[PDB]
Ligand binder design. Structure first.
Ligand code: MG
Ligand code: MG
Lengths: 119, 124
């Protein structure tokens, strides 16, 4: 059940996407925003275009193992973003998914905190 | 820090959080078999829809602590005719995601695992 042992890029991203959504939802679900606004704020941080900047914002610092995960992760034209952004976005979800599995659930809080200190 | 589940939390807010919590757990369990995306997604959607969560709710509701039974109930009682299910099922689907959402906020993540265990136990 090791990291890259049985988990592929997409499989890691699949898990990371769900993790990311949960965190973004937990954070905005505390300001008493109404359903319509609550969705707008979350949707602005759950999209790939934004997910990309979060990556380019931490990739150069994350642990080696995670740097490799993201790397291969950047390998059907995207609807609302650059092919380059959709890949990094996957790289981000793939990395998150990995940290979670490795119980390294602290490098995540450090990535989430960077998302909150911006909006 | 947040507030109490009743301090200022609507059943719709919990169900919102609960929904994300439910997906995560479901993808986790299925992401360990080695299925391919199409297949993986197929198994996930199967236990992530309103009809299924509804079976869950109706199978646990009577055994949940008082505090949860309340949340579940107020959450049930939409002016939005559901598509794949009925009004009652959709409501119980929200009530279920409301309870799951609540347990989490109350650090009762161990109570969530017990419900998730009845999701895959009835799957094998
Ligand atoms: Mg995603
Ligand atoms: Mg749902």
């Amino acid at each position: 059940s090791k990291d890259i042992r049985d988990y592929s890029g997409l499989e890691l991203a699949f898990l990371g996407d769900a993790i990311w959504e949960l965190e973004i939802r937990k954070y905005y679900l505390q300001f008493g925003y109404n359903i319509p606004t609550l969705n707008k704020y979350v949707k602005a941080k759950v999209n790939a275009k934004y997910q990309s900047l979060i990556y380019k914002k931490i990739i150069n610092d994350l642990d080696e193992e995670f740097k490799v995960i993201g790397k291969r992760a950047k390998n059907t034209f995207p609807r609302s973003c650059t092919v380059m952004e959709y890949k990094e976005a996957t790289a981000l979800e793939a990395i998150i998914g990995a940290m979670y599995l490795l119980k390294k659930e602290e490098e995540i809080k450090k990535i989430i905190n960077i998302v909150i200190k911006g909006e």
